[model samples]
Target: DTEKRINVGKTHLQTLRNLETRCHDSLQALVVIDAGSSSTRTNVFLAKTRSCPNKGRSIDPDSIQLIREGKRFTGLRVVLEEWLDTYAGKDWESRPVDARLLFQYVPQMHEGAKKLMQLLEEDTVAILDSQLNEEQKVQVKALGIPVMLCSTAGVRDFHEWYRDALFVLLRHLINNPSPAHGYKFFTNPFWTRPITGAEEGLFAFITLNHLSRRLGEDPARSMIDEYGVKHSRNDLAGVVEVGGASAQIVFPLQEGTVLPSSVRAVNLQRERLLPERYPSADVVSVSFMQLGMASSAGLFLKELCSNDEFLQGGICSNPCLFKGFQQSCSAGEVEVRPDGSASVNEDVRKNRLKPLATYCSVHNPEISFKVTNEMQCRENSIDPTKPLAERMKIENCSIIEGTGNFDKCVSQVESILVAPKLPLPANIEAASSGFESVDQVFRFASSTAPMFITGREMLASIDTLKDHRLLRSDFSGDVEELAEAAREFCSSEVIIRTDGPVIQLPNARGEQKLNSLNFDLCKTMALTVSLLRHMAAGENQPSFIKWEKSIAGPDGKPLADLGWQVGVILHHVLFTEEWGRTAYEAGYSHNLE
Candidate 1:
């Protein structure tokens, strides 16, 4: 049945193959977006001619670029700060509060939730308008072309609610193009809601499948009879992705790999011509909410500082920050309680994101790993009467020695994450509490600080999640056994790489670069969707990139680490007749009746 539905005419297949490199001038560019917690990115793509040649993969240092990409902050945490302020308006509260007071008033402020959606819409509008080219600019009057937009975990603050407004905004934006830039906001044939952990994992698995193409198509899949069952013991690749507020994992699964209750399975269409190794086992991906780099960074800082309360003198010493390195957030932000319902107050500053760092400490690059400031704050008393920015100012700007141990830093991170099992799966509860382990790994401009965890070094520890024992209630297996099993299971059959469109540079406009783990999703996401366009029909119509079963990088090399690998493939998929129908053509898009 699946084969019959997907069967295309040889003539059409050839036509689609022609659509591979460049497409007709009439079609609108497909918009592929990968929106994560800290930031959101938008890239516009045109259909390719079927005869298109292989452009380049993220693996090859020379083949990446973004034609017209725009990015902006979409930090849900930052948005929440604003949301909280709105909720506890002029009358209800006067001053100091952290996440505790933030949420306490949230239930009453439907507008708090409502405003979050508004902000997201506004954000979407900004980039879409700014990034489009003359040809790309000509999009639908709403969500255009079959979209494979991958929405990750950060939006969980008001996930269900956010989508409600997101849909309306898309429809509105398309109907009314941005006044300033005039790019049309478009919708899809049937674009789905934000992705789930299951789908997120599926995207990575597909990516893994795509990169391992050197092995070529799946023999068993090609030989399988029409019934669709194959007995080949297919080899697999696994993906371990870390982000700002969450992480995702997926690979070919086996019946024996006792999965955690939190683990999810998704079946997907065969996005590529051949079978993929990692997904050959089946749809297996799991995402941990508090496991991302940025989230952990902030959470750990709060722990060391207690409540980021500013002293009369500048505080020094940090476990993760380098000696001279410094980071600062508004004194207004305090630590959110571990349980998430309440907050901590070092003195009487208030309960915002606890232990707010107003300005970053100047990182001492000369020395490595000496942090006198770690877990120690030395400063005079603050005058409540004075402003926080003023109170936190430091004349000396002290520096400390950092332990500078990759192996040890993870112990603290592990204590924060793997304890009491990773926080409840995204669906089980509100997940408002348990911010204790919420930390992030920031990329500093300087070389490895004497202290601090980094994307480059953190890969080893991040893969430890492959250990099933770590996912269980009790440590059931041998410590060595689990260690070896994790080693073998996560061996680099699937290598991790990065696409340097934007890196965490030390520049003043510190645009968030895709950490090695964070951008892997985009690597796969763009490809999976690129492959999909060739499989069916339709412009801007969305297919579930979710691997219910079927499956599916970058580094800027000599060429300045740019461009998307999936660009050519997507062009073919969207331009050629084989992919499907045009979901967003002129004024043709129709919302649910």
Candidate 2:
């Protein structure tokens, strides 16, 4: 059981009830769960609305303030209860039923939810000064403390059925009246949904602007000029988020600039939160579909498997992977949706995730929908049709062994960073000698361009490291130092196989040993450096880019991981009333102040 009954003195009960009354009057507690690809973060935030002048139905943006009380991080891996425990019990053969039979990543989601339940209970008791008993928790739940679960990248990359299954399980878990369940303290009919990578990025942008106090000063001033051109504010900061399956970038559009069709406009005005919206400064958001750390690693592994050496022998060396590390990889399948759309058609569901040893650019023109770049699509489609399985074929079985050369690793990584400026040859046959599809090339270049041009966005934050301890013990240096650390790490002797003790590798910087839970540290560092170098050459470098790991709470104490959760809470507290109610009439109003 998550709670114990205690004899509450009359005086203490009265004091707590008064405090609860005050809490209900001023603030609303929301359990915002970030269901990401590799891990799930459950954050408890107390959002308060201050007194402000309300013009008709609109509420002032300055009136909304958020205080993050606590957070619990859990890896999506099935067997581990701790965060970042990636390698533990991760055998594909022995894995149990997760998601549907389509993909086995569902067990991780179930376990992740269970872990968050324990965390939510711990956080709730702690926040209430440990005076909360079973009876008190019931009263607290009755007070309408709401919960929201928003997933990105990981869920987005999968089919609709998988997403539906994840939430379906989550609802049952939350609504279960079992005494041991930690989620029982929260209100039911909660908001649980999937968000696009671009929306997540935009939320992070909103968090930064709201916390840094950039959006509240002037409602009279417009981001648009008399000429009907939108301009970016210098005060607001842009946001770039890197997850497992996708990467997101959201920034203010420059003055008189032509807007990309993918750009999303977010309005901070609470009443104007409807479809037509604009903030103090307008933002344009883009989510590159398959360019996240995990996705990139998967794509690169497939690329390495198709190499001439690997084709002949079942093993090939990778520069980006750590020297002693080796992973068995196979040629993965390419999902074909109807009409080139991302969603699966009910009638064509069987064709959704079929394996393809080779994809024909000539046969699958709908493959263009799989592409993120416009030029690549036209370039890929310009050539005559030919079944790729005829001439181009990838070896299905191969092991990618790590060589650990930083320069070589970066060089290899550059091939995957697809940009419009460096277009691959139009003909799919010419792009790679034995590659499966042009879709592979198109996937890399998706969101890499604008992210490449954000010069000042190279700053590193603690959340970027996946494990926060790595920053203090192993990496307390500049960007150059980070590069050297990766170089040394790649050269270390460590085999990250399917079964082994949780290896503690020697720290690249100091005497400390780092946990080899998820051994993608070196690869992540290499990617970060390559991206920074690309952004370093951009002409539109901002004056500064603040890379914040955590923000001071209302009490000026450091709260939880400063990421997209802040953005979500801001939306809930500030803008959700008018728009959220209309969009989802259910859980949006339970705790609205």
The Cα local distance difference test for each model comes to 0.35, 0.45
lDDT of 2 by residue, 109-155 (tens): 56766666666556654664343466655544433445667877544
Give the winner by TM-score. 2
TM-score of each: 0.47, 0.57
Worst 10 residues of 1 by lDDT: 441-450
Ten residues in sequence with the least summed lDDT for candidate 2: 349-358
Model 1 TM-score, 2 decimals: 0.47
